[PDB]
Scaffold this active site. Structure first.
Site, PDB file in Angstrom:
ATOM      1  N   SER A 145      51.831  68.976  49.461  1.00 24.93           N
ATOM      2  CA  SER A 145      51.067  68.642  50.660  1.00 24.93           C
ATOM      3  C   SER A 145      51.714  67.441  51.356  1.00 24.93           C
ATOM      4  CB  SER A 145      49.612  68.336  50.286  1.00 24.93           C
ATOM      5  OG  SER A 145      48.753  68.546  51.393  1.00 24.93           O
TER       6      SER A 145
ATOM      7  N   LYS B 124      56.122  66.560  52.217  1.00 21.89           N
ATOM      8  CA  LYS B 124      56.889  66.130  53.377  1.00 21.89           C
ATOM      9  C   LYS B 124      57.753  64.971  52.880  1.00 21.89           C
ATOM     10  CE  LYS B 124      52.324  66.453  55.634  1.00 21.89           C
ATOM     11  NZ  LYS B 124      52.247  67.918  55.947  1.00 21.89           N
TER      12      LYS B 124
ATOM     13  N   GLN C 163      49.064  73.074  62.084  1.00 23.17           N
ATOM     14  CA  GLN C 163      49.298  71.646  62.257  1.00 23.17           C
ATOM     15  C   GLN C 163      50.584  71.453  63.050  1.00 23.17           C
ATOM     16  OE1 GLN C 163      49.936  69.019  58.688  1.00 23.17           O
ATOM     17  NE2 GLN C 163      48.455  67.693  59.743  1.00 23.17           N
TER      18      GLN C 163
ATOM     19  N   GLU D  87      46.999  61.158  61.603  1.00 26.16           N
ATOM     20  CA  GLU D  87      46.402  61.170  60.271  1.00 26.16           C
ATOM     21  C   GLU D  87      46.913  60.051  59.362  1.00 26.16           C
ATOM     22  OE1 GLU D  87      47.295  65.211  58.913  1.00 26.16           O
ATOM     23  OE2 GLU D  87      45.456  65.878  59.908  1.00 26.16           O
TER      24      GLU D  87
ATOM     25  N   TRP E  12      47.147  76.388  58.263  1.00 22.76           N
ATOM     26  CA  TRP E  12      47.426  75.011  58.668  1.00 22.76           C
ATOM     27  C   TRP E  12      48.866  74.575  58.385  1.00 22.76           C
ATOM     28  CZ3 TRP E  12      45.587  72.179  62.180  1.00 22.76           C
ATOM     29  CH2 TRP E  12      45.678  70.775  62.172  1.00 22.76           C
TER      30      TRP E  12
ATOM     31  N   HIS F  32      45.626  75.703  47.645  1.00 21.76           N
ATOM     32  CA  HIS F  32      46.577  74.658  48.011  1.00 21.76           C
ATOM     33  C   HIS F  32      47.021  73.795  46.827  1.00 21.76           C
ATOM     34  CE1 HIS F  32      48.800  72.123  50.656  1.00 21.76           C
ATOM     35  NE2 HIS F  32      47.969  71.096  50.624  1.00 21.76           N
TER      36      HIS F  32
END
Length: 362
Positions: A180, A184, A226, A234, A277, A313
């Site tokens: 998640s 990144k 997203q 965020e 998303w 997820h």
């Protein structure tokens, strides 16, 4: 690269094999320069400046904890990582540095290093901007966004392991992973730290394996996905400068296929999943372009991609276990397992996003 350049819009994914100024990339050496250029551009407009090794760096190991001490220009910080060892394997062990421990099964014969990226750079909300040990050292106003800060941290963990063989980690066999928001981060770490032999970004979506351009297009078509404009609100993952391009992505002289390409020819296995998303089709189209970097370097099987149906997820699926193990064995354990893995239930749409060819680099 000129200090002052004029950006231009490019609706499709940028050509990985043409320098910003238009020079053609036809050799492996030239691609090395091209990678440095893309890294420079990415830091300038999206992730912020990546500091080099601090002037002072010492470390020590006790129990199962590695302590890292960093000093630079009169400032100094200290942070720790915990290590878990495998029941199999020979020391020094290859290892995977996991952001917050990551969300993957602990590989056989591979040690796990729990990296608390939050302490290096906070990610509670927008108010976390400039907060974290990285900033306590470089300054609250440093351009580095959190992901760059995190990457810097990982590099320090590797430096420390080099200084402390007593930690029993093989510094030539280190990977990185995160899921998640931490995915990144893992992608950026692999891109910025060349010593990382295997990068495993898990369900990283926007800011990770997805391309800003494709996600925007999907959003404009009505997808609940997203995008760049929404993500910067965020957390301070990206540089503040990025907020100026978030609503005009086409002008960026790169996209995330460029970011991923910084890992080539090193190992990269993108572990994705169908969750709207995340933008699975954007991730696949993006990584398909990124893969061309490895294809050009004659090492296509060094980069894999996998999205198989949908699942909870960050709950690693059993249908991807053999694929992960294949990459782990090849890059962390030095085996020759087959790693020709590149699949998705979505269409890459290459004719729409890729208008450049892939050369065989000399």
């Amino acid at each position: 690269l000129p200090g002052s350049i004029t950006l231009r819009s490019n609706a499709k994914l940028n050509d990985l094999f043409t320098m910003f100024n238009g020079d053609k990339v036809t050799t492996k050496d030239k691609f090395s320069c091209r990678q440095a250029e893309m890294s420079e551009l990415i830091q300038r407009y999206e992730l912020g400046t990546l500091p080099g090794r601090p002037s002072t760096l010492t470390a020590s190991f006790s129990g199962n904890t590695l302590t890292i001490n960093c000093g630079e220009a009169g400032k100094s910080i200290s942070f720790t990582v915990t290590i878990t060892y495998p029941s199999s394997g020979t020391a020094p062990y290859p290892a995977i540095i996991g952001y917050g421990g990551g969300s993957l099964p602990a590989p056989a014969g591979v040690a796990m290093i729990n990296f608390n990226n939050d302490n290096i750079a906070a990610q509670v909300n927008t108010g976390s901007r400039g907060q974290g040990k990285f900033y306590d050292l470089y300054g609250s106003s440093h351009s580095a966004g959190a992901m760059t800060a995190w990457a810097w941290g990982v590099s320090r963990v590797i430096d420390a392991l080099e200084l402390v063989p007593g930690a029993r980690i093989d510094t030539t066999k280190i990977g990185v992973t995160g899921c998640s928001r931490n995915g990144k981060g893992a992608m950026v770490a692999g891109a910025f730290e060349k010593r990382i032999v295997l990068t495993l970004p898990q369900e990283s979506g926007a800011g990770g394996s997805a391309c800003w351009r494709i996600s925007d297009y999907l959003k404009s078509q009505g997808a609940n996905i997203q995008t760049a404009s929404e993500i910067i609100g965020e957390d301070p993952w990206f540089s503040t400068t990025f907020n100026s391009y978030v609503n005009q992505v086409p002008v960026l002289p790169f996209d995330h296929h460029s970011l991923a390409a910084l890992i080539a020819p090193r190992g990269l296995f993108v572990i994705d999943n169908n969750i709207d998303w995340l933008g699975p089709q954007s991730c696949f189209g993006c990584m398909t372009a990124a893969h061309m970097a490895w294809q050009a370097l004659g090492v296509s099987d060094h980069m894999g991609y996998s999205q198989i149906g949908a699942h909870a997820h960050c709950a690693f699926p059993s249908n991807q276990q053999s694929q992960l193990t294949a990459f782990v064995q090849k890059f962390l354990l030095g085996q020759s397992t087959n790693t020709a893995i590149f699949q998705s239930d979505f269409s890459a749409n290459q004719s729409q996003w890729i208008d450049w060819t892939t050369p065989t680099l000399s």
